[PDB]
Design a protein around this ligand. Structure first.
Ligand SMILES: [Ca+2]
Ligand SMILES: [Ca+2]
Ligand code: NA
Lengths: 223, 58
């Protein structure tokens, strides 16, 4: 997260870290046994880390649970990045508490201008490299599909949406993928891609979760 | 033809922080770099062994 702030220990209880020997992506807990992340975050031997703040130190509220299943959307396209969503089942059910909680799925899509919370342990620099120990947060608005398409000609599908600030300086970055974009208590987006990070006229692109609610519910129930 | 082993490492547009290997011609060895998760170029390997086997001595 570039241009954000320190969330505060466990203030984003649904945020999880995907670990494969190190943190490589984020995710969102939707129930005690399921996590929503990005399709490009599919990797071997995933271990989901819940209740995390400082990802480099054991603080006492962590729950490390291996992925028992990793279901990438059947229509995911690794070239266009369309349908960039993946569902991860936890090998054992997570113990829910104030620091480990699920986030509700949306009932309807969010309108342009709606303020949302984006979080993750990704790069905090637009130019250069710096990865945080603790979870970072960013308040950013959903942008119009017209502005999103103008920013990324011929790249925005109906399953993507832009969020952020056109002037640059505030955005999600490498290491944030798969993480949440929560608006009014609903998971509206998944950190997906963009042209660099926090660049002027290049807002972050996110997977449009509201288009996948029925698929998410049915897929979880069939696994 | 152009040697793909001599191309600079490519992170790509996606926002994952996946550690991969690339052959660094200037240094003469396989080094680590951050791959974003999509649109990988060929000078991108999952292990140092894969990198050396494919680009060693380029
Ligand atoms: Ca920790
Ligand atoms: Ca290296
Ligand atoms: Na802390």
């Amino acid at each position: 997260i570039v241009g954000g702030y320190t969330c505060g220990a466990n203030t984003v209880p649904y945020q999880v870290s995907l670990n494969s020997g190190y943190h490589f992506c984020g995710g969102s807990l939707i129930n005690s046994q399921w996590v929503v992340s990005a399709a490009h975050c599919y990797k071997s031997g995933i271990q989901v880390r819940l209740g995390e703040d400082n990802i480099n130190v054991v603080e006492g509220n962590e729950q490390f649970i291996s992925a028992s299943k990793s279901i990438v959307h059947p229509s995911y396209n690794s070239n266009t990045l369309n349908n960039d969503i993946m569902l991860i089942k936890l090998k054992s059910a997570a113990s829910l508490n104030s620091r480990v909680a699920s986030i509700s799925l949306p009932t309807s899509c969010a309108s342009a201008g709606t303020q949302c919370l984006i979080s993750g342990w990704g790069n905090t620099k637009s130019s250069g490299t710096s990865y945080p120990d603790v979870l970072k947060c960013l308040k950013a608005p959903i942008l119009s599909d017209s502005s999103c398409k103008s920013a990324y000609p011929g790249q925005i599908t109906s399953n993507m949406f832009c969020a952020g600030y056109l002037e640059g300086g505030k955005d999600s970055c490498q290491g944030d993928s798969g993480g949440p974009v929560v608006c009014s208590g609903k998971l509206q987006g998944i950190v997906s891609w963009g042209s660099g990070c926090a660049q002027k006229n290049k807002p972050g692109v996110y997977t449009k979760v509201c288009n996948y609610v029925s698929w998410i519910k049915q897929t979880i129930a069939s696994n | 033809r152009p040697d793909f082993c001599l191309e600079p490492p490519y992170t790509g547009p996606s926002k994952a922080r996946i550690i991969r290997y690339f052959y660094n011609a200037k240094a003469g060895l396989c080094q680590t770099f951050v791959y974003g998760g999509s649109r990988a170029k060929r000078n991108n390997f999952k292990s140092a062994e894969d990198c050396m086997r494919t680009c060693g001595g380029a």
